[PDB]
Amino acid sequence: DLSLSDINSTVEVPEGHSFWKTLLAYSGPGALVAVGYMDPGNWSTSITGGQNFQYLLLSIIVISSLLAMLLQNMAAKLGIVCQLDLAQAIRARTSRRLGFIFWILTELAIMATDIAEVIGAAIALYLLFKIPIFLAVVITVLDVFLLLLLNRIGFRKIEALVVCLIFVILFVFLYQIILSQPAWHQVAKGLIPSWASVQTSPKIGGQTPLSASLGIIGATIMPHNLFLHSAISQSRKIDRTDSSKVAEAVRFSNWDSNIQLSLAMVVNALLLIMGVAVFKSGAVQDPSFFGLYQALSNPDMVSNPVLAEAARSGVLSTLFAVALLASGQNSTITGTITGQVIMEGFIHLRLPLWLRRLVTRLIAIIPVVVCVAITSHQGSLDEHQALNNLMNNSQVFLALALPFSIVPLLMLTDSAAQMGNQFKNTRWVKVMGWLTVIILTLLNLISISSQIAGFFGDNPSSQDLLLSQVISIGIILAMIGLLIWTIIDIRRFT
Ligand SMILES: CCCCCCCCCCO[C@@H]1O[C@H](CO)[C@@H](O[C@H]2O[C@H](CO)[C@@H](O)[C@H](O)[C@H]2O)[C@H](O)[C@H]1O
């Protein structure tokens, strides 16, 4: 009846004021959440944003990472204080049909992330081991056994294995930046919140600064990682009776989370400056993982004689594919954990880790093998580009499930009927939190129409355009009705 019953309140190791050892003990949760923010679903957009705007968009990465740290810390607070996850709070404060809608929506979100991870991992196999594209996918389906071995390890090592992956993809991209020797003064200048990123005038590669910036801001948080953080934050036992101990517990998980999401922000920065310093100006014509592989393996695409010799040897691209693998491993852990959370929290369905990863991975690979089937039926022509368009079109479910995850979080944590007059949010985070939630909800409701129209490809059928307008209006209005309904129920609780 409590979230993550297998590992809930497992190891509590606060020892007086021995803080940093106490930090070492529970540092696990934050990395599990952050590694999701390094998935290859936006690797191209950081490199593309770098080529189109050298170092300019680095500040937007910082701001987005700050907002994500805010909402993530809020979810961790709900888990720590209330000893229950975000799904259990929402489901307890609304009916079952709303918990079911939220369930299917978040299932679709983690499914979209899973589609990104299976595409990137399968392509990683096609690049590293030269496995055929159709075989690499059905090889990625075998991660259920890696989950069986994953199940016996334990969170003191699982949450450290996630750290291992994090520093794998962090050192892979940092290594190609170390060889690049970039002008770190222009990087510093880029990290400062300037107003050139909010303008619309450069328009390089069909992208204005305001468009790229508003995209980075719009894709700030992942809805499933909120429920994830609120569930994993409970894995540390707390007496819930000593205010200094729970205040300490909140400091604990906060410093953890920021320590990890800061690493994710560093990875995004390494991707942008990877697009600025490593690649030549405009060398990336194919945002696909294969396009970045050949672009990282062509000496004329780099901007340094050392990167040309290393690229000719063939180490820059292989490291890239390794990073693709390490990123593709994340949805196997966090997808199963979060899927359990939203399942047994929203619809009260107790399912094992066996059938969970099976169903999610199958539903994820069905459109992948359909796409590979059609493109290989066209002669393996534009097969990687179509996989990239599938990966990008999948991310609409995140925009569908985002408001119903950030709005109830902010409400339930801002009410004293859930946190109490002692641990509710400061007036400082009330303003920043509501500002962030409003901005993200508006931006994603804007993204709905763009992605729904993007389903019909770059070929704008005049009759299908109006249909995309009707469907978009219907979807955003339906999300408005669901949103005001949820607002009404939660505010009835408070
Ligand atoms: C597209 C146009 C964009 C315009 C952007 C303008 C930004 C306005 C910021 C408003 O700030 C919040 O608005 C909530 C609504 O009025 C207030 O009530 C809130 O009060 C509690 C939080 O303190 C919550 O628990 C409640 O659910 C909620 O009603 C809340 O006090 C306040 O901080």
Residue numbers in the entry: 13 to 506
Show passages lifted from the paper.
at a resolution of 3.3 Å. intertwined and aligned in opposite orientation within the membrane. that, in this crystal form, EcoDMT exhibits substantial structural differences. similarity to ScaDMT allows for a reliable comparison of equivalent segments. ScaDMT adopting an inward-facing and EcoDMT an outward-facing state. EcoDMT has now revealed the opposite endpoint within the transport cycle. equivalence of EcoDMT to an outward-facing state. α-helix 4 that is not observed in LeuT. be suitable for the coordination of Ca2+.
